[PDB]
Assembly symmetry: C2
Amino acid sequence: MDPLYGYFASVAGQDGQIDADELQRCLTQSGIAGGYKPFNLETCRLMVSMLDRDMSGTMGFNEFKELWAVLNGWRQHFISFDSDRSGTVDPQELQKALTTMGFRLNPQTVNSIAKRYSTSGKITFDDYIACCVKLRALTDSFRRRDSAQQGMVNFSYDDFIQCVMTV
Amino acid sequence: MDPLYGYFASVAGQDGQIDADELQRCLTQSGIAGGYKPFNLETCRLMVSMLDRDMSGTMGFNEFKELWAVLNGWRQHFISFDSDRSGTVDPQELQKALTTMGFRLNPQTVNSIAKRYSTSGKITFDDYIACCVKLRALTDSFRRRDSAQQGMVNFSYDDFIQCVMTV
């Protein structure tokens, strides 16, 4: 029996699928934020997108399982830059943080990202996560199309729009 | 004198620049929702972002006037699909709404977005605008790079990520 199945079973529908609302509820019940403020609906809708390679708009337990482990790792990284347990990190940390967790980005990019994701000059745990989710999803969709890994993908307007608007 | 000046002057700070929060307050003050619920912060940050092309996270009064005009124009098309002034619209409507917004996308593509922006089955006014705002910003970012107007843009990974993560 999977330690996570209980939470899932609790909100999941008879089809074994949960939506962003339900996801947020069991993520909350799982206590994964562990200390920090539980994630919010919009952030959860994004986690759904990152694992919904179906346009189903829901996820199943195997996915829930995978999500939880990713999230748990990211919270670990974040905590390491949250010396003072504040639930926020500042813009400069984020460049170091983003970099040091499997993300392959140049300094410029990281800074603009750090920028857009700041509220009052700091970046909260929740926003840090949302950033990482969306960052992982888009990199997956990119890699998907970069079938020669040239770090170059020739989008078509419609593909570019649907690809990004759905994440 | 632009009729809009009074609201802007009301919230704008020293240098006549307003951030997402202040924009939220004058769009509200201006009464553009006109019955529907006031836009929430995140949708406003998205607006400020669609207009701020130097990531200062603010806009002047000329930007405010542009936005207001565009917004008001979008709520007009919304208003016609929402006869019962419920405040929402359903997926199948959206496709027709965006088509006549002047967007030019795939029926299939409009569907995935329509799905993604659906909630409880319908799309709220606010999400309708968050969608339009984002669509506008992304089509602008794509055109920029499609100078020979092919309908195709060969993105680099860091440009792609940079472009999308900041909208």
